[PDB]
């Protein structure tokens, strides 16, 4: 369900490992359960630190 | 100021008195580094006097 | 094959650091990343090799690799686990 | 102030509202690689209900696309339509006017006070390829045009502002500019904008650094009036070995492109260190190793006078004074008198024998090497000296170095010789 | 007067932040396949030779190594940010490994 | 500063528990009450909980001291606590 929703925000009809990684890492309890697993071809969530940005 | 055209060509002053007019203009502006033989400084002085 | 640790080139490790959100890279860090990558690969390769040797085989398969990784708490999904 | 010339400047060319393309392939972002996953900022649309303005992606907002020099596109970004990061597309230029002053042509002035980092005006023109650029450049050189109108959008792609463009073509070069050009991405295209480097007030001229590649063209003298002016329009040298000292200063020492080549070719190529191109630090070894020949040209004398007025180095002044010692042409000396060489020599003395950055013996050698041509030059009136009053400096330095008696006796002879000369008239003024 | 004005260069960090977004949006492998395969063979050679390596095993090893390196660099970026710096140093790598327990 | 090193040497050479027994016992009972009521507790379970919590807190303080050392400081701060917890994987 979460993977299909995340695909729907990406305007795609094909579920890929990227959408699965997005669905797992964006949900707190699912991230807690699947903490120590690496999703093949899943990539990384976009995260840029606040003080890393210029002023 | 060093160009081909001349300020005094638009006046009634004869060309034989151009250095006289430039010495008047240079001495009026309280310049002291001026020398009579330096035509360039005379032209600069008269240009800054008439068109500051 | 002789000293191909330099095959992990500087733009590649720069890309790997860049995915982690790192903005600036020190000039001395590359040897350290090569060393830690060598250590990790050494451990996983060792475990996969003894898994294969127990199986009386001469070719390391993906199942041994996924088994070794999962035994180190680094479970991998997508390769027949 | 100067009269407005905005409409007159506009009539000189075909005004454009947007950049024109020679073909649809040129000017595309990412070398034409269409990023179908366009970078969408995560900003939420902030609509002020009173003014009906979408305040999202503002100047002090944290829009990632704005920081990365990418403009939001309506209908694709979460910021919504009419966000505050559509400056190029909405064409919200700063209010500017056109005027004329000094030796410059038309120039752009700020009609209002403009904040720091604010977008001023989008540089407009025709996007052209390299061959079309070469053809147009050859045509303009045949036409004798004395104005640059080309900017490099990117590698192999140029923008011409000669016949068609915008008001930005009238901006003049400044060696200490208040604005700068930057490259931005709008959609799948590349734009060149002009942003304010500092706070600019109304009426002030808007200028940017040209950083111009000559492509082998001759230098053009810079009349910007900035104190940090290098005197000519250019940029980085086309190769190393090209300059070690500034031209006027290098040609003052008798050095040329060949002599500046030879030193670097003899040492840098043979494992000895020569720093990059920077005239803030003088390399004394090059100046000592330079060859010296007498001056017989008045333009070279003017360059020598400029070098005296500019260079602070002890060694460059030593070698220039030595070259003057070799020089014995009376007409060049009369030109130096007209240039008031005595005025420059007073400061050259003062910096070395009144301020003490060197050793007393070496300063004594310098003073003996600089009194000789002062003794030798033709002089016919104290009015030459009166433009410098260098006699006062001579008295101060003979009094300071009173223990070195040859310098004192030479200055005695020099002031005795100068005391006998005639004087010339200054018109009295009313009181 | 046919010269060209130059577009100058980007500020340090702008192209860095751009490529940060580009690599965090896309998912392709960042390590070259053949040098990594040779490195894996070099490490495996030290125990017992004549060991053939299936393509799927090499791909799994590459994916695991990339995931490990990305996690380590995230931790090292946190370490650098904690020390009021924006540049990561090897000391942050060693400290991250120390606190993670990988290094004794 | 001297008594800081004296306390470090004394506690690093000692082996007895540093958390007081009765407040920890009441804390354990108070925490366990809201999961299930009328709960009884063996003494050895409370001692095991105390020993495990003390070992965990000692390890956390050691890693926090390392984090404080990294930032050219000698005083530990809460930001060191959440840095150590974040890197170690707790949330
Ligand atoms: N500081 C400066 N000193 C001298 N010439 C300058 C200058 N800045 C710009 N220019 C001249 O202006 C050209 C750029 S086009 C600027 C507008 C043009 N002068 C006009 O009024 O139509 C340069 O190539 C140069 O010839
Ligand atoms: Zn935005
Ligand atoms: Zn926007
Ligand atoms: Zn200038």
TrEMBL record, chain B:
It is found in: Chromosome; Nucleus. It comes from the Eukaryota. Belongs to the SPT6 family. Plays a role in maintenance of chromatin structure during RNA polymerase II transcription elongation thereby repressing transcription initiation from cryptic promoters. Mediates the reassembly of nucleosomes onto the promoters of at least a selected set of genes during repression; the nucleosome reassembly is essential for transcriptional repression. Histone H3-H4 chaperone that plays a role in maintenance of chromatin structure during RNA polymerase II transcription elongation thereby repressing transcription initiation from cryptic promoters. Mediates the reassembly of nucleosomes onto the promoters of at least a selected set of genes during repression; the nucleosome reassembly is essential for transcriptional repression. Essential for viability. This is Transcription elongation factor Spt6.
Automatic annotation (TrEMBL), chain D:
Its EC number is 2.1.1.359. The keyword Transmembrane does not apply. It is an enzyme of class 2 (transferase). It is found in: Chromosome; Nucleus. One of its GO terms (molecular function) is RNA binding. It comes from the Eukaryota. It catalyses: L-lysyl(36)-[histone H3] + 3 S-adenosyl-L-methionine = N(6),N(6),N(6)-trimethyl-L-lysyl(36)-[histone H3] + 3 S-adenosyl-L-homocysteine + 3 H(+). Keywords: Chromosome, Methyltransferase, Nucleus, Repressor, S-adenosyl-L-methionine, Transcription, Transcription regulation, Transferase. Residues 36-92 form the AWS domain. Signal peptide: none annotated. This is Histone-lysine N-methyltransferase, H3 lysine-36 specific.
């Amino acid at each position: 369900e979460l993977a299909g929703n995340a695909a729907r925000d990406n305007k795609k009809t094909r579920i890929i490992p990227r959408h699965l990684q997005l669905a797992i890492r964006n949900d707190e309890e699912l991230n807690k359960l699947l903490g120590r697993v690496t999703i093949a071809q899943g990539g990384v969530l976009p995260n840029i630190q606040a003080v890393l940005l210029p002023k | 100021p060093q160009g081909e055209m001349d300020l005094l060509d638009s006046t009634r002053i004869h060309p034989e008195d151009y250095s006289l007019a430039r010495k008047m203009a240079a001495d009026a502006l309280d310049i002291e580094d001026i020398d009579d033989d330096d035509e360039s400084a005379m032209r600069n002085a008269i240009y800054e006097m008439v068109f500051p | 094959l002789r000293d191909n640790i330099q095959g992990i080139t500087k733009p590649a490790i720069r890309r790997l650091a860049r995915r982690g959100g790192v903005k600036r890279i020190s000039g001395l860090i590359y040897e350290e990343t090569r060393g830690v990558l060598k250590v990790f690969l050494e451990n996983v390769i060792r475990d996969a090799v003894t898994y294969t040797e127990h199986a009386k085989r001469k070719t390391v398969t993906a199942m041994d690799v996924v088994y070794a990784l999962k035994r180190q708490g680094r479970t991998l999904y997508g390769f027949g686990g | 102030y100067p009269a407005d010339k905005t409409e007159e400047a506009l009539t000189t060319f075909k005004t454009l509202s947007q950049n024109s393309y020679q073909n649809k392939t040129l000017g595309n972002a990412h070398n034409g690689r269409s990023t179908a996953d366009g970078m969408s900022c995560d900003c939420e649309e902030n609509w002020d209900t009173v003014s009906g303005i979408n305040n999202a992606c503002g100047e002090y907002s944290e829009c990632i696309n704005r920081l990365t020099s990418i403009e939001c596109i309506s209908g694709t970004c979460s910021c919504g339509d009419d966000c505050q990061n559509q400056r190029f597309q909405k064409k919200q230029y700063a209010p500017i006017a056109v005027f004329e002053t000094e030796k410059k042509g038309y120039g752009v002035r700020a009609q209002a006070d403009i904040r720091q980092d604010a977008f001023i005006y989008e540089y407009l023109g025709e996007v052209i390829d390299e061959s079309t650029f070469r053809k147009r450049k050859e045509n303009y050189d045949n036409q004798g045009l004395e104005h640059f109108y080309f900017m490099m959008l990117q590698k192999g792609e140029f923008i011409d502002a000669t016949a068609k463009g915008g008001l930005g073509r009238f901006c003049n070069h400044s060696c200490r500019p208040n604005a700068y050009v930057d490259k931005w991405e709008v959609g799948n295209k590349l734009r060149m904008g002009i942003f304010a480097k500092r706070e600019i007030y109304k009426g002030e001229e808007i200028c940017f650094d040209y950083n111009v590649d000559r492509y082998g063209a001759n230098p053009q003298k810079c009349y910007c009036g900035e104190d940090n002016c290098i005197g000519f329009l250019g940029g980085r040298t086309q190769t190393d070995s090209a300059n070690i000292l500034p031209v006027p200063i290098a040609e003052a020492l008798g050095s040329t492109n060949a002599q500046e080549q030879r030193w670097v070719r003899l040492m840098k190529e043979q494992n000895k260190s020569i720093k990059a191109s920077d005239y803030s630090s003088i390399n004394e070894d090059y100046v000592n190793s330079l060859e010296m020949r007498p001056i017989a040209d008045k333009d070279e004398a003017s360059k020598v006078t400029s070098a005296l007025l500019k260079t602070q180095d002890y060694i460059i002044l030593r070698k220039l004074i030595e070259r003057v010692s070799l020089t014995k042409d009376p007409e060049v000396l009369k030109e130096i008198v007209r240039l008031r060489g005595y005025q420059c020599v007073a400061n050259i003395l003062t910096m070395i024998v009144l301020d003490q950055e060197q050793q007393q013996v070496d300063v004594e050698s310098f003073t003996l090497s600089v009194l000789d041509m002062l003794e030798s030059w033709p002089n016919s009136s104290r009015n030459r000296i009166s433009s410098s009053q260098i006699e006062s400096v001579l008295e101060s330095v003979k009094t300071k170095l009173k223990k070195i008696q040859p310098i004192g006796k030479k200055i005695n002879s020099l002031l005795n010789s100068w005391s006998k000369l005639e004087i010339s008239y200054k018109i009295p003024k009313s009181q | 007067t046919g010269g060209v004005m130059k577009p100058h260069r980007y500020r340090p960090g702008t192209v860095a932040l751009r490529e940060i977004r580009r690599y965090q949006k896309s998912t392709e492998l960042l390590i070259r396949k053949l040098p990594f395969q040779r490195l894996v063979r070099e490490i495996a050679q030290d125990f017992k030779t004549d060991l053939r390596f299936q393509s799927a095993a090499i791909g799994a090893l590459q994916e695991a190594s990339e995931a490990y390196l990305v996690g380590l660099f995230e931790d090292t970026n946190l370490c650098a940010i904690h020390a009021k710096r924006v540049t990561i140093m090897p000391k942050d790598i060693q400290l991250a490994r120390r606190i993670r327990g990988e290094r004794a």
